[PDB]
Amino acid sequence: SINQKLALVIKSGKYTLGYKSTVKSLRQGKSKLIIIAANTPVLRKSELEYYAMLSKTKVYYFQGGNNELGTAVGKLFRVGVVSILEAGDSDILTTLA
Amino acid sequence: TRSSVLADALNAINNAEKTGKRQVLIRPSSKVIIKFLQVMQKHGYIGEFEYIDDHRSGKIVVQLNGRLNKCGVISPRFNVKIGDIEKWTANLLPARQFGYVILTTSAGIMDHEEARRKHVSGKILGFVY
């Protein structure tokens, strides 16, 4: 049920795809949720978790690799991490999952 | 699938007539069907019939008087030259004094005798006797 929430965010809201822009939004305190692919390297996901704890940001662990996270965000390339900057009429933010 | 609502209507009327019922339901009952029944009703082979309006192409209830021996379509609707009507009537009708072959001409649905009177021809729909 996360694929449709993510797709409606992609349709209506604002997001960044990728480690560098995700970390940039985390320091600027613009992210409200980060989705991390399952095959993300553990050092990278630990550092994203640290950044999220410092910025008081929600973390969601996508049950899938970067290939189908990229598929889930309507993309033809691999995305390791997604950051939501402001969700539209989606309930992905208020939903715990 | 349904390919000829006229064929369905005339087969239903034949089956009701052979079983001896004095009424029959026709669905979906197009306007070619209404014209064919009007020809049969003009020549007396059926009684009154009433169209039932649903918003889904309609139905017809036909009262049968027991006078029908056989009504049927000719499929496909062959083109008939003015001189080939006699060939069709010879093949399809039991005698020369009664029975009709129904044509569809540019002047309308009609029986072969009216077609000869108006000197028109067209396509063959069916027959009644």
């Binding site: 095959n39 390297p41 690799g65 970067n66 290939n67 691999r78 | -």
Partner: protein, 91 residues
């Protein structure tokens, strides 16, 4: 254009050694020279160095595998069995 009807990669062997041996070799060399998915970085960049050694062109990770395939059916079965035994031991 299609250059061979059936010999494929074994067209390098010409007419010698027998068609059955060439077919067996064709199957295993196609398997041996295929590119494979990386289980770590998710790219289609895993190639065989030598028998049993499979290296990803990016992320430079090397995994021990089969002689002509990254994973053998026996190794997958063993992985599932070891996971099941581990789960009952830990629970």
């Amino acid at each position: 254009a299609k250059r061979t009807k059936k010999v494929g990669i074994t067209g390098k062997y010409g007419v010698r050694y027998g068609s059955s041996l060439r077919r067996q070799v064709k199957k295993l060399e196609i398997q041996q020279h295929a590119r494979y998915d990386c289980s770590f970085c998710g790219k289609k960049t895993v190639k065989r160095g030598a028998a049993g050694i499979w290296t990803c062109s990016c992320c430079k990770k090397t995994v021990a595998g089969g002689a002509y395939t990254v994973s053998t059916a026996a190794a997958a079965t063993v992985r599932s069995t070891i996971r099941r035994l581990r789960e009952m031991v830990e629970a």
